[model samples]
Target: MTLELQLKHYITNLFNLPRDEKWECESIEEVADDILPDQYVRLGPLSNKILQTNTYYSDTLHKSNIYPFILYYQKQLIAIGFIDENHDMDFLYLHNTVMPLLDQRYLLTGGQLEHHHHHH
Candidate 1:
């Protein structure tokens, strides 16, 4: 299946409902603001600080085409970064709770995971 289709399917399973376009983020700025300073304190020490301003989204992270999505569900915030060209997706961060996924949906059927399994 396509990455778009897989993501939709994963989101349905994750939320027990269809994808909600209304909750989807149109830009990275929309997500950067909802995060709290207290939350950054828990992000651990990185190479540099994470700026609170939306400019940070443009400056060093989440370029316009990266297809970043942030969702607030069950009182938690989750972030996903994707690139359509490479059919790659990363679950960047989560706050307020922990959730586990059973099936991996971010990859195409014959992708790297399958290759790794076959190699072993």
Candidate 2:
């Protein structure tokens, strides 16, 4: 799937809803759409994929891949980043910044683990 579609896929899993419940969101797409136009292939081995922004840094330090993205929301700049491994535990390791990322929708999928990020 395209990265946008992948975001929907991953974010859906991240919401951590019960099998009997159905929860969905859209704001993330609006914000993440801003992240769409910037998609470009990172040439080279993913074994060295790492991301950083001023004070935040990914811990995939050895073999995982990472993508860094920023968005404009509530007239504020939203700083976000996520990582995935080439093999092991490749999931959307989102940096919880600014807003409740777990509560938001849209993300790229990689590996496993469905986590909840709700402040409610």
Candidate 3:
């Protein structure tokens, strides 16, 4: 699926009835749409495919793959990011939260878990 569509799907799953039952958020997409147009992809068809931002300084890294996910504060997409060999982890341009990541949807998939970032 296209990244935009993927994002929409992720938000939908996050705000679905079951998840909202616990967190109480009604619209993840509304919030996410605001945050996105975010610095995610670069300027091209391959934009969403590769790492748009520099992940680490210690070592070179590229996205192994990026599936969509939601950071729900009771079921909302307060934030979104690409999961690399890491679990959608990053600590540079944006602070990498130690908080758990929720799997709301998928666009791309598969890889082993590695350290969240690189800085050498």
CA-lDDT, candidates in order? 0.36, 0.34, 0.32
Q: 2 or 3, which is superior by lDDT?
A: 2
Global local distance difference test of model 1: 0.36
RMSD of each: 13.7, 15.3, 16.6
Give the clashing residue pairs of candidate 2, or none: 7-107, 90-111
lDDT of 2 by residue, 1-120 (tens): 444344434533554322333223223333232232232213222112232222212332222233323343344443334433433222233322333334323334443345575475
* Residue-wise C-alpha lDDT for candidate 1, range 1-120, written one tens digit per residue: 444345444544443443443233242333333343334335533113332221112211232233334444433433333333354544433333344333333332224434545555
Q: Whole-model lDDT, candidate 2?
A: 0.34
lDDT of 3 by residue, 1-120 (tens): 454344444433433312222221222223332333444323322222221221111111122233334433332223445344545443112222233334433232322356467675
Ranking by lDDT: 1, 2, 3
| Stronger candidate by lDDT (1 vs 2) | 1
Show model 3 residue runs off by greater than 4 Å: 1-68, 86-120
Q: What value does the lDDT take at residue 43 in candidate 3?
A: 38
Instruction: Return the top candidate by lDDT.
Output: 1
Q: Which residue pairs collide in model 1, if any?
A: none
Error of 2 at 46 (Å): 22
Q: Among all windows of ten consecutive residues in candidate 2, which has the lowest summed lDDT?
A: 40-49
Q: Output the better candidate (1/3) by TM-score.
A: 1
